[PDB]
Amino acid sequence: SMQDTVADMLTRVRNAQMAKKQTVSMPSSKLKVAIANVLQQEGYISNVEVAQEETKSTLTITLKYFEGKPVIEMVKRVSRPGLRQYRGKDKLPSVKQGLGIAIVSTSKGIMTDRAARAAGIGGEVIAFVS
Amino acid sequence: ARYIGPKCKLSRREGTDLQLKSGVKPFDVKTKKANKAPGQHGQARGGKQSEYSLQLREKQKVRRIYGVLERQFSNYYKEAARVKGATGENLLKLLESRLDNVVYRMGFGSTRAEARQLVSHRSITLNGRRVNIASIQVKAGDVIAVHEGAKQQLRIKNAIELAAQRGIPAWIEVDHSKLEGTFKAAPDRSDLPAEINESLIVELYSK
Amino acid sequence: ATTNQLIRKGRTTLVEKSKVPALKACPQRRGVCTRVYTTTPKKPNSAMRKVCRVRLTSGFEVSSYIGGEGHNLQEHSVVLIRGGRVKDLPGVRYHTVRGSLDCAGVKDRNQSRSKYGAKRPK
Amino acid sequence: TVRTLTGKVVSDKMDKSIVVLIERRVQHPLYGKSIRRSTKLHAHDENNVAKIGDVVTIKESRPISKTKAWTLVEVVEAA
Amino acid sequence: LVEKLVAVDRVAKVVKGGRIFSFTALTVVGDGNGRVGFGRGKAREVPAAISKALEAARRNMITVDLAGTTLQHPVNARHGASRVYMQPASEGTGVIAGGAMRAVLEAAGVHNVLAKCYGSTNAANVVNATFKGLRDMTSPEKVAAKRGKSVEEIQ
Amino acid sequence: MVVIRLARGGAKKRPFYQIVVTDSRNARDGRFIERIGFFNPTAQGQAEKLRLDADRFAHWVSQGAQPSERVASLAAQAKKAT
RNA sequence: CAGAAUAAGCACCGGCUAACUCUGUGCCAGCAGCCGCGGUAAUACAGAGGGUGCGAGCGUUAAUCGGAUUUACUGGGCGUAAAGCGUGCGUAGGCGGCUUAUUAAGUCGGAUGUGAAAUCCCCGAGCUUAACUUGGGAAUUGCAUUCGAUACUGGUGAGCUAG
RNA sequence: UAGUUGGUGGGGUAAAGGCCUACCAAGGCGACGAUCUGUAGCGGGUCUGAGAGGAUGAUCCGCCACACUGGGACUGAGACAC
């Protein structure tokens, strides 16, 4: 059964980018929307939309392609249900010598590792994007 | 221990003048066998070598001129690596700071071996006291003089006359009339010859 | 392996067996020569190579090669043995030190004298 | 100012004594995964108020018997 | 244009009444300022194989965007069963790498780098892996351009 | 009893003493309660010869610690110097 | 004060690996860490000459870690190279859909106490230099108490329907 | 596992305590490894390693244990005492 919806979302985005799709859709959740907002702010994706039919909620993401290649080149799930990963403020990972982002869930909300270091807090390392 | 024996074959093997003789007669007239290795199977300079051969041959050339053995040279490299800066220039500065080499560059000895013998036989005073260790590190603003009994030595007079032909370094201010001098600063890399390559030595010691 | 499998049962390290069991973690051993003889090499080598069966102070009986040309050993000699294989001889895992206790140094030898235990010529 | 623990009672058969199970969650030193560990502490309960299944608090004290060195403070929740 | 000869091997082909022997050569050419390429050559004799390998190397070249004299970021690359890891280093470190990586890095103009091979160390495969890693390495300007941001925003 | 005494260290023929407060039954260079200074009878040049923490010395004397003869002489000399 | 007077050996030279020839012997004598040398021109055995590396030392044996991503947490695999149980059901356990309130166990942050000295590292000091001795720092990545944060995981209450 | 696990009265100790004793109850530990068995003094540290790890516990410092092999107590502030 499905036991990691965040990993499902990341895999959907990865496969859509590899297949050169324009948009990608999934069932929605607040955590997924929070991650997508960080991606949009950092500029890896273009637009985030949430639609509601009744109790169902759908998340739609518009993908970006610059030159020939997709903008999101690498996206890796770091923390997983079988192995949770927590880091302090001094040991937050850096992706590609600061050229990528690490998505971190902290007590002040989801941010990048750069913002987490600026705020001087740690948290759970969700994913690496580059 | 210090190497004792023939210096000309040592210079020939590395393929350059190692400044191991006084210099009254040039290297070519002194040896007549340059471009030939000392062995009967000795060949020309154009013989190809491996990278391990080149690195080793550079380190041996660096050691032979200063008269330093392997243990002390390895300790020199280990200190230079620890000190912050360029490792090669640090090693060159350490080699150029030895008391015997400073005495030789002050012109009190025709060769570095003569300078070493002068230092060892207590003929040299550093900052007013008689020392006998050739490996003493000279620091900035130091004073090296010739001892009273050491003065009036024809070897010393010939040494200073021969040194007059060479150019006195910039970091050494020497009064030949009083047989005294002051080491002012460690030589920079530009002052030293550029034929010495130290990247090979650093690679060899850092493998 | 999964993380849970690693937690339940970790990784296993296999011990390495010594290639010189009779020395018993000692640089050398003393023994009594039980039988001195000659053997033939395994192919593709052919010779008559000198070996001795020795009983060690560790409680083991082994075979040890005699290096060099010309030896004065025999039964009941007391010898010192070190480690070292002979390769083409099956089952010879040790060497006999020349010129140590009863074994003598090789004769008329002037290079590599520290091996084979020959003193300086006059 | 006195060390205290919260747990659940797993035995009340003994006279004036209870066995409370304390649970903690730690990281595995090598593999990093969060695991759970359990310890059983005998505690002193003067009036036998505690029963099997309640959630209780116990504080450290001087020894009362061979195995009991903790004493009941209160019953947080009842079965 | 610096040219390095990484490897030379003698190969055999069986025919009736004997074997035909040949030579293969692998070469890496570069300009020392971010342009490098590699090639292979086969011939009955060594010099012709070397010349053909050099010609192929000059035909197959790429441009690499260095950060000074070192890499922009850590690189993981692989070709077949050969995997390579490369890491930027501070000035004075040197090229701490195996010979096959070293030729490519020096021809490309890298002066300080720490590198490692995992798996097979076959020369051609290692050269391919290092070549791919250098080709795929990115830079802050390209990252900012692709994300629609500024390099100061990227940091 | 509690004593204030000298524990020896340094090299052969060149002793260097730490001034320590300790139980008298302990070994000379072993377990101690607190170190409050040092003494170097062969100091040359810029080397310091005697440093004593007078506050800790007085505090420990007020609680019954007994200085040795050498330590008492050193304390008197340090007080005279300062 | 006297007078060069009292003071150099060891290993190696086929490739890995810096350093090559001549005699002697002829699958013998022998060498060998691995691949391998020796069966009449042996740069690989023994001697000699020459050279190379070290130097009051030089080699051999033994032992630990490394190279070994060759037990792979960092950091490996299972169609044919070693490796998916013959196939199901199911116990302990591991993991687990969406929304909301609350808690604060995991998680994160601050403060305080502690983490002996010596040792390691840094700047100095004294030894003719160095080893060595020594002043002061830094570090001791930990532990405990207490005060905070609530995104995620866990607990509790309520609700939902895509499993 | 049957003084075993807990309780009460009493004894005992410098002092808490099945430490001992008489009764009362049937408890206590264990797959988070009890019981049995092999090996081993522990730490600060030392060697190696990029690190994570691996190996180690001479000389210096702290703690523990032992004194030909076992069982005891006396004196004393302190010993079950090289």
Ligand SMILES: NCCC[C@H](N)CC(=O)NCCC[C@H](N)CC(=O)NCCC[C@H](N)CC(=O)N[C@@H]1[C@H](O)[C@@H](OC(N)=O)[C@@H](CO)O[C@H]1NC1=N[C@@H]2C(=O)NC[C@@H](O)[C@H]2N1
């Ligand atoms: N293989 C023989 C196939 C025969 C087979 N029977 C065919 C068959 O049955 N059905 C047809 C099915 C065809 C299939 N759908 C298409 C396909 O195979 N896609 C994948 C292959 C892509 C492409 N085709 C090959 C390619 O780009 N190579 C380059 C090339 O060698 C060289 O670069 C240049 N430019 O020269 C090198 C750098 O020097 O980088 C290589 N790149 C890479 N090396 C890496 C590596 O190994 N792993 C990981 C990743 O890093 C790899 N990328």
